């Protein structure tokens, strides 16, 4: 409360560490469905069904231009990529499997790096 503060966690390296994690995501061999925005003109159903599209290149642009206020808003966008993927793709599809794999990959890096 007013003039009563918790000890200050060091957040000065958060931007650099998130960028490192995103680089490792971008270079994973199963990243290919997620590198660029889904083409809303060419993929039936995607625009109407998926209310907030998100992809690695969009996250990279937001990270490089100061659009994440903290490391949690960054994690929310990464998770959104995989939540969208589950919504639109069967678990037993190449893209469905890729999404499950990448989510597992991310959450381990997240825990090891910040928790
Ligand atoms: C990330 C993603 O769901 N991409 C995607 C899914 C189905 C399709 O027909 C084309 C692209």
From Swiss-Prot:
Tissue: Expressed at varying levels in several tissues, whereas a smaller transcript was expressed specifically in testis.
Originating species: Homo sapiens
Annotated protein name in UniProt: Bromodomain adjacent to zinc finger domain protein 2B
Localization per Swiss-Prot or TrEMBL: Nucleus
Family to which the UniProt record says this protein belongs: Belongs to the WAL family.
From-to range in the entire protein, with total length: 2054 to 2166 of 2168
Residues annotated as domain Bromo: 9-113
Assembly and binders: Component of the BRF-1 ISWI chromatin remodeling complex, at least composed of SMARCA1 and BAZ2B, which regulates the spacing of histone octamers on the DNA template to facilitate access to DNA. Within the BRF-1 ISWI chromatin remodeling complex interacts with SMARCA1; the interaction is direct. Component of the BRF-5 ISWI chromatin remodeling complex, at least composed of SMARCA5/SNF2H and BAZ2B, which regulates the spacing of histone octamers on the DNA template to facilitate access to DNA.
Role according to the record: Regulatory subunit of the ATP-dependent BRF-1 and BRF-5 ISWI chromatin remodeling complexes, which form ordered nucleosome arrays on chromatin and facilitate access to DNA during DNA-templated processes such as DNA replication, transcription, and repair. Both complexes regulate the spacing of nucleosomes along the chromatin and have the ability to slide mononucleosomes to the center of a DNA template. The BRF-1 ISWI chromatin remodeling complex has a lower ATP hydrolysis rate than the BRF-5 ISWI chromatin remodeling complex.
